[PDB]
């Protein structure tokens, strides 16, 4: 919150977040989205049998693929986008222990937390925005601008300061549960594994000095704050 | 919704906030979202009912970009300025809605023939206009209004208008307001989740009707999407205050 | 017994009850078994953080405009200059893009009032340094080369350094308690009809164009280090004040311009391949 | 035929929507 | 009724019963048998009244398999989908009923001519449609509505619709809902026990009407028979969710 | 005196009162001497053991299906396998027979929910012995030859011996709080019309076919004594759970197929021989 | 239950309510969101020295 004078290990006034068997530190301040509620009450009706949590597996931090930001990138350009949970099961971090319960259970409710860590130098500058769109299936190509991102739950990343960002994502879906996996025997009438979309977009282009670096990198990390699974079945490979 | 005061870190002095103008002109406040959605929108303006068909189908969904006219596209029976109504603009910000809708139907007649309005619950399809159900050529012996479903009659000689409130008879928690492309052929069960059923108008003889829609008292919206990319050319069709 | 009923009253018959109104009374017939049964919001209901009014939507920050500020920009130079009218972005050209939340919802009303809030985010680092002056100018506007005219109005000077953001409430100072919208109340033109003077003469109203302007001028020239960029972008956000007001529902000035397709009958209209 | 019905293969996934990999859609 | 829990002797452990969905979507419960029987069924859809006859007879009985259409049989004036209504399906489970029925009659006119609806108590016959009582060729001088029986008038210029409630004026404790064969010539007094009387509509000039029926407030059913042998082909006239 | 009556009110005239509803208000005129007199249920009334709701009818046990279990049936073999949908028995063929009470009444509604109860009565004696496993499978279904896939779901293993009956509650585990009916809401086809794609394209809705299956597999092979039968029949009963729910009245999916004759005028229509 | 409503009254239908009169009753429909909302005279109102009658 307040910096100190320089010592052997610089300004040693870092903060950190410990979740299960994973720790992530931060050198500067962090921005955090509002803690907002999910749909509750339908759980007990939708599933006759009780739902299960596996906090040790699911509630740990897991890094996903690296994002490169360049000076060529213009405002409104998608740096990356994620259909969740699908892309965290069968695209990013496929060997993560977070994905183990999705092999056996067919349904679930999912509240996520996504931390973003940027590393640009002090002679660079730029703005990136990350936002969430709830129940985005067949509505990804509309309300998908920087302006829509600023309206929806979001976090803002300055590329010079390297402030961290934490997006809290509730479960807001038009059904009681989301389907975890497609299967050859299962119906194709319902799109599974997608209750929301995450967009990483350029708000202001990356700029650099004379003979400076023409790019810098951002790393997302995800965890489930509340992952309740329902409908046990035989284990299958993910997608 | 994110207000964005989170990002406003500056805490320097500012000018006065003043006093609100709300209540000064009148007490008729028109800022409430529910109040805006509860006043009616014209869907169909003098459209024909034909007794050769089952009836004129009306898909149970609020006004939005789904019913927006675009210059060049195929001519529909829909009102062209549905997309430019206040409540359509509001519904373009919320992709979820739950509760009842109210349909004001006016039959252009003074005859003693009864015109029946039948409610169909969520069956998974999405149609509008005149349709022959199962492509038959006779529906007087097998009317939709006498199949078992909930029905109400209009008797124009008594009253040519009616207001009917349709329930939220669906499997889903929320109804989906809009899609990016309304004519895209995707997963068929998801395709039909933009409606909660249908309202079918069946006459005795050929007659015209007009249809309005509004939100019920028991009605909620959620899943705020923010404003989309838009265009306007209103400036061009008006003089300024300096000639 | 069968006694006569002498009670009577005069009545005025109307076809609909509360047709124009958004609240009050309704004569709506429920298509239900129970005529007084309603939808349950016991479990599934509107989330508390969702906006309940159009004023709540107007309180959302939205990116209005952007401009560049460089070391070449001499003192007194207009970095930014616009008529701050929430009715219309331009009076003399077409608009196409992502309009702010407060502009979008203001487009639905014929009248607006109250202060407007701005926020200037300087996309810079600690090694950028300079000073600008934000000015709200009313009735009479300043010359582009006359900085002194801008300085004589309601101003806020911001020293750019470690802090890279500044807030600015634009006061509401007008001859009327509310301002009428510069956009039209009703526009039946749908197919980009080539306009003439007869079309304009038979318009819905007359556009009362605003002379209120917000400007940003250089006070101290930007003097960054050689190791960093010489030019920076400045993001200009906008929203309604805490006492922002709206009244008189009308045809929406803005409408979706991207991915607009009208509905068809599914599956009758050639869905079965 | 109607071009809105089906999305071209290069920009879309198996579920007939824009792929998450295809960034240029915006 | 036998629930059959008697026969369930097993008392081993089972999965959870969970929580009911009743009340979650809405409070409009539609499970009550009486509530289902009290909503109307279309009997006659635009049928002619002719003043050369005594009137159009309507036998006082609820909708059931008795009024079911079968492909191939002789064409009647009845609605074809009476047998497929919810309440007809319910009445096929109960062979006894007692109480009043309510008949909604709509005259397709706006004229000032009065159309009379006369109630006949249980006389032992069972007829429907236009009939010349005692095969005469003149009924204006000897109308059924001016013989002494209870009668009500419709004046279409004022209101083309009416709802009339017919009493349980019969000798029997219960009325018989249905028979195995409705056209079988058996013991004549037993044959007529499927109705509690008639409702006769008489016009001035030639005019069409439509008729609905529902159960009254004072109404009970009993003598549970269980489900019969049935058939369906609904699958064939619909696409699946996988194209 | 004859003073003027200044009292008045605005009214909205409707032809019928409470026409759609099963309860509430009615404007029905009694064909009686006394207009408020009703039928007496003092002596003759509905018996207390008779069902009052459609849910009471759904709680009656009904014989759904039957299957054989023999000593030749090797371990892991599917003795029984069905999609357990109370909307339709088959998706790919016509049904004709005695449908269960819970299926019959569910056919009247567009929506259903809650657990479904099954009961397996083994038509055997004390000298029959073996073991089966009942499994409720959701979303993803098992291969016929892969018993392990069935074992990974919600199962109940029954040791057949002195006890010759087992109960099984099938849990309700779905993505929605209720499921819509696979049967049609309205079907005007009465004369077995030869269907085409245009007829299907102009249907009332789209059939959301269920992937939920209940299966019975051999655990231990049936090993009866030589003195008794080597094969036995198993009766599969079905009913709605205690929290079974129904909503959205529609056209009945099922209709009588046996001894259907329309009424005629008695005695005018040739009753007098 | 669905009991019959036996209540009724004789009425004399007129097209307008209080058409000739300057005061009393009116059947006027407000072109507003709220049907009972009226113009505010809290700040802006008739000045006390202005004439209230023709006398």
Interface of chain C toward chain E, CB-CB under 8 angstroms: 30, 32-34, 37-40, 42-44, 267, 272-273
Report how far residue F68's alpha carbon sits from residue F76's, in angstroms, rounded to the nearest whole number.
15
Report how far residue E170's alpha carbon sits from residue E101's, in angstroms, rounded to the nearest whole number.
13
From the CA of B224, how many Å to the nearest CA of chain A?
A: 7
**A153 contact residues in B (CB cutoff 8 A):** 1-2
E135 in contact with chain A, both atoms CB, cutoff 8 A = no
The DSSP code for F110 is E
Q: Are A146 and A203 in contact (CB under 8 A)?
A: yes
Question: Nearest-CA neighbor of A140 among A223, A82, A218, A188?
Answer: A82
Question: Nearest-CA neighbor of B96 among A171, A46, C264?
Answer: A171
Report how far residue A121's alpha carbon sits from residue A142's, in angstroms, rounded to the nearest whole number.
34
Q: Are F85 and F103 in contact (CB under 8 A)?
A: no
Q: Which residues, at least 6 apart from A148, have a Cβ–Cβ distance to it below 8 Å? A: A131, A133, B225, B226, B227, B228, C98
Out of E26, E28, E239, closest to residue C272 by CB? E239
C262 in contact with chain D, both atoms CB, cutoff 8 A = no
Interface of chain F toward chain B, CB-CB under 8 angstroms: 12-16, 19-20, 108, 110-111, 176-180, 184-190, 193, 195-196, 198-199, 202-208, 247-252
Out of F139, F176, F177, closest to residue A106 by CB? F139
What are the structure tokens assigned to A163, written together? 């402030």
What are the structure tokens assigned to F42, written together? 């003092």
What are the structure tokens assigned to F180, written together? 């819509």
Tokens 């004001």 belong to B104
Q: Tell me, letter by letter, the H, E, C secondary structure of chain B.
A: CCCCCCCCCCCCCCCCCCCCCCCCCECCCCCEHHHHHCCCEEEEEEEEECCCCCEEEEECCCCCHHHCCCCCCCCCCECCCCCCCHHHHHHCCEEEEEEEEEEEEEECCCCCCCEEEEEEECCCCECCEEECCCCCCCCCCCCHHHCCCCEEEECCCCCCEEEEEECCCCCCCCEECCCCCCCCCCCHHHHHHHCCEEEEEECCCCEEEEEEEEEEEEEEEEEECCCCEEEECCHHHCCECCC
- Asked if F touches D (at least 3 Cβ pairs < 8 angstroms), the answer reads no
Q: Which residues, at least 6 apart from E116, have a Cβ–Cβ distance to it below 8 Å? A: E143, E145, E151, E152, E153, E154, E201, E202
Question: Nearest-CA neighbor of C118 among C165, C69, C51?
Answer: C165
Q: Is C218 helix (H, G, I), strand (E, B) or coil?
A: strand
Residues in chain B: 243
From the CA of E178, how many Å to the nearest CA of chain A?
A: 40
Interface of chain C toward chain A, CB-CB under 8 angstroms: 42-44, 47-49, 60-63, 66, 98-101, 121, 123-128, 164, 225-229, 231-233, 235, 256, 258-259
* C223 CB burial (10 A radius; 0-12, 13-18, 19+): exposed
What are the structure tokens assigned to E191, written together? 């044959």
A175 in contact with chain B, both atoms CB, cutoff 8 A = yes
**F25 contact residues in G (CB cutoff 8 A):** 2, 5
Alpha-carbon torsion, ordered G38, G40, G46, G47, to 10 deg:
160
Out of C48, C125, C231, closest to residue A122 by CB? C125
Q: Give the mutation candidate from B117, B144, B147 for the E interface (greatest E CB count, under 10 A).
A: B147
Question: Nearest-CA neighbor of A173 among C44, F69, E96, F265?
Answer: C44
Inter-chain CB proximity B152 and F252 less than 8 Å:
no
The DSSP code for C150 is H
Tokens 């350029």 belong to A202
Q: How many CB atoms lie within 10 A of CB G43?
A: 9
Inter-chain CB proximity C261 and D1 less than 8 Å:
no
Residues in chain A: 239
Inter-chain CB proximity F12 and C27 less than 8 Å:
yes
Inter-chain CB proximity B228 and A140 less than 8 Å:
no
Out of B163, B218, B233, closest to residue C39 by CB? B218
DSSP states along F164-202:
-EEEEEE--B-SSSSEE-SS-S-----S-----HHHHHT
Report how far residue F241's alpha carbon sits from residue C90's, in angstroms, rounded to the nearest whole number.
65
Q: Which chains pack against A, by 3+ Cβ pairs within 8 A?
A: B, C, D, E, F
What are the structure tokens assigned to B46, written together? 């003098």
Q: Which residues pair with A81 in a beta bridge?
A: A199
Peptide bond into A97 cis (omega under 30): no
Report how far residue E88's alpha carbon sits from residue E62's, in angstroms, rounded to the nearest whole number.
8
Pairing of strands F8-11, C8-13: parallel
Q: Is A22 helix (H, G, I), strand (E, B) or coil?
A: strand
Out of F184, F193, F206, closest to residue B188 by CB? F206
Which B positions 75-134 lie with beta carbon below 8 A of chain F?
Answer: 120-125, 131-134
Domain-wise residue ranges, chain E: 1-243
Determined by cryo-EM
Q: Where are the beta strands (DSSP E) in E81-206?
A: 94-107, 115-121, 129-131, 151-154, 161-166, 175-176, 197-202
* F241 CB burial (10 A radius; 0-12, 13-18, 19+): buried
Q: Are F39 and C43 in contact (CB under 8 A)?
A: no
Q: Are F173 and A47 in contact (CB under 8 A)?
A: yes
DSSP states along E129-141:
EEE-TTS-S--SS
From the CA of E34, how many Å to the nearest CA of chain F?
A: 8
**D5 contact residues in B (CB cutoff 8 A):** 183-185
Q: How many CB atoms lie within 10 A of CB C150?
A: 24
Residue in A with minimal Cα distance to B176:
A174
Q: Which residues, at least 6 apart from E213, have a Cβ–Cβ distance to it below 8 Å? A: E40, E41, E43, E62, E63, E101, E102, E103, E104
CA distances from C193 to B239, C107, C201, C260, F33 (A): 16, 22, 15, 20, 72
The DSSP code for E66 is G
Number of domains chain A contains:
1
Q: Which residues, at least 6 apart from A127, have a Cβ–Cβ distance to it below 8 Å? A: A156, A157, A158, A159, A202, A203, A204, C121, C123, C235
Residues in chain E: 243
Question: Nearest-CA neighbor of F232 among F96, F114, F126, F103?
Answer: F126
Inter-chain CB proximity G3 and E165 less than 8 Å:
no
Q: Where are the beta strands (DSSP E) in chain F?
A: 8-11, 29-30, 62-70, 78-83, 95-98, 109-113, 116-123, 130-137, 154-160, 165-170, 179-180, 213-220, 231-240, 245-249, 255-256
Report how far residue F30's alpha carbon sits from residue A144's, in angstroms, rounded to the nearest whole number.
63
Size of interface A-B (CB pairs under 8 A): 92
From the CA of C50, how many Å to the nearest CA of chain E?
A: 21
Q: Is C251 helix (H, G, I), strand (E, B) or coil?
A: coil
**B6 contact residues in A (CB cutoff 8 A):** 31, 33-34
Inter-chain CB proximity F206 and B121 less than 8 Å:
no
- Tell me which residue range forms the domain holding A230: 1-239
Out of C37, C272, C273, closest to residue E28 by CB? C37
Inter-chain CB proximity C233 and A203 less than 8 Å:
no
Q: Which residues, at least 6 apart from F165, have a Cβ–Cβ distance to it below 8 Å? A: E7, E8, E9, E10, F119, F120, F121, F122
Report how far residue E157's alpha carbon sits from residue F272's, in angstroms, rounded to the nearest whole number.
43
Report how far residue C101's alpha carbon sits from residue B222's, in angstroms, rounded to the nearest whole number.
16
Pairing of strands B41-49, B175-176: unpaired
């Amino acid at each position: 919150e307040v910096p100190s004078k320089e010592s052997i290990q610089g300004d040693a006034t870092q903060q950190s977040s410990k979740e299960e068997n994973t720790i992530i530190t931060r050198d500067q301040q962090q921005t955090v989205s509002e803690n907002i509620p999910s749909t509750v009450g339908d759980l007990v009706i939708a599933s006759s049998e009780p739902t299960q949590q596996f906090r040790s597996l699911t509630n740990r931090w897991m890094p996903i693929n690296s994002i490169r930001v360049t000076v060529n990138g213009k405002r409104n350009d998608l740096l990356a986008q994620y259909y969740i949970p699908e892309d965290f099961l069968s695209t990013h971090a496929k060997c993560a222990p977070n994905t183990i319960p999705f092999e056996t259970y067919v349904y679930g409710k999912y509240e996520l937390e996504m931390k973003f860590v940027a590393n640009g130098n002090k002679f660079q500058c730029g703005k990136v925005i990350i936002s969430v769109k709830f129940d985005s299936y067949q509505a990804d190509n509309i309300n998908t601008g920087f302006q829509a991102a600023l309206s929806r739950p979001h976090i803002m990343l300055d590329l010079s300061t390297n402030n961290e960002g934490v997006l809290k994502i509730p479960f807001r879906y038009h059904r009681a549960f989301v389907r975890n996996q497609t299967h050859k025997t299962a119906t194709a009438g319902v799109r599974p594994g997608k209750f929301a979309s995450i967009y990483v977009q350029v708000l202001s282009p990356l700029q650099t000095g004379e003979g400076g670096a023409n790019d810098m990198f951002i790393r997302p990390f995800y965890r489930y704050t509340r992952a309740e699974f329902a409908g046990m079945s035989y284990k299958v490979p993910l997608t | 919704m994110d207000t964005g005061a989170k990002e406003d870190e500056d805490e320097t002095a500012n000018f006065s906030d003043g006093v609100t103008a709300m209540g000064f002109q009148s007490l008729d406040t028109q800022v409430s979202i529910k109040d805006i959605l509860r006043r009616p929108v014209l869907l169909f303006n003098h459209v024909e009912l034909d007794p050769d068909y089952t009836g004129f189908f009306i898909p149970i969904m609020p006004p939005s970009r789904m019913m927006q006219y675009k210059s060049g596209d195929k001519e529909t029976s829909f009102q062209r300025l549905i997309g430019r109504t206040p409540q359509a603009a509001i519904m373009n910000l919320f992709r979820f809605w739950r509760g009842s809708l109210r349909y004001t139907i006016i039959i252009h007649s003074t005859d003693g023939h009864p015109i029946y309005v039948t409610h169909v619950p969520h069956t998974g399809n999405r149609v509008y206009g005149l349709m022959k159900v199962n492509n038959l050529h006779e529906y007087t012996k097998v009317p939709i209004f006498g199949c078992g479903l909930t029905t109400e009659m209009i008797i124009p000689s008594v009253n040519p208008s009616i207001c009917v409130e349709v329930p939220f008879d669906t499997e889903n928690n929320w109804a989906v307001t809009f899609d990016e492309d309304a004519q895209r052929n995707y997963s068929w069960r998801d395709k039909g989740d933009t409606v909660t059923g249908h309202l079918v108008v069946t006459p005795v003889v050929s007659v015209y009707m007009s249809v309005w829609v509004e939100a019920g008292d028991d009605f909620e919206v959620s899943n705020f999407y923010g404003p989309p990319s838009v265009k306007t050319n209103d400036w061009n069709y008006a003089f300024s205050d300096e000639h | 017994d069968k006694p006569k009923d002498v009670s009577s009253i005069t009545i005025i018959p109307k076809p609909r009850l509360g047709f124009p109104h958004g609240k009050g009374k309704s004569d709506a017939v429920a298509m239900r078994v129970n005529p007084v049964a309603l939808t349950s919001f016991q479990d599934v209901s509107a989330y508390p953080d969702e906006p309940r009014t159009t004023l709540d939507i107007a309180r959302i920050w939205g990116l209005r405009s952007t401009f560049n500020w460089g070391s070449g920009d001499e003192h007194g130079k207009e970095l930014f200059n616009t008529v701050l009218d929430p009715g219309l972005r331009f009076y003399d050209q077409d608009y196409e893009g992502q309009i702010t939340p407060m502009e979008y919802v203001t487009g639905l009303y014929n009248f607006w009032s109250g202060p407007i809030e701005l926020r200037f985010d300087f996309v810079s680092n600690a090694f950028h340094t300079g000073t600008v002056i934000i000015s709200a100018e009313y009735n009479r506007s300043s010359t582009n080369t006359d900085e002194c005219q801008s300085h004589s109005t309601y101003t806020k000077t911001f020293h750019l350094g470690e802090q890279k953001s500044v807030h600015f409430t634009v006061p509401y100072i007008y001859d009327t308690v509310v301002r009428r919208n510069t956009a039209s109340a009703y526009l039946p033109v749908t197919d980009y009809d080539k306009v003439d003077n007869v079309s304009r003469a038979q318009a819905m109203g007359i556009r009362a164009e605003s002379k209120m302007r917000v400007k940003v001028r250089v006070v101290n020239v930007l003097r960054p280090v050689a190791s960093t960029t010489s030019t920076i972008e400045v993001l200009v956000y906008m929203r309604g004040g805490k006492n922002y007001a709206l009244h008189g529902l009308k045809q929406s000035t803005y409408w979706p311009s991207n991915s607009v397709v009208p509905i068809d009958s599914f599956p009758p209209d050639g869905y079965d391949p | 035929d109607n071009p809105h019905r089906f999305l071209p293969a290069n920009v879309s996934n198996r579920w007939n929507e824009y792929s998450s990999a295809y960034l240029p859609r915006v």
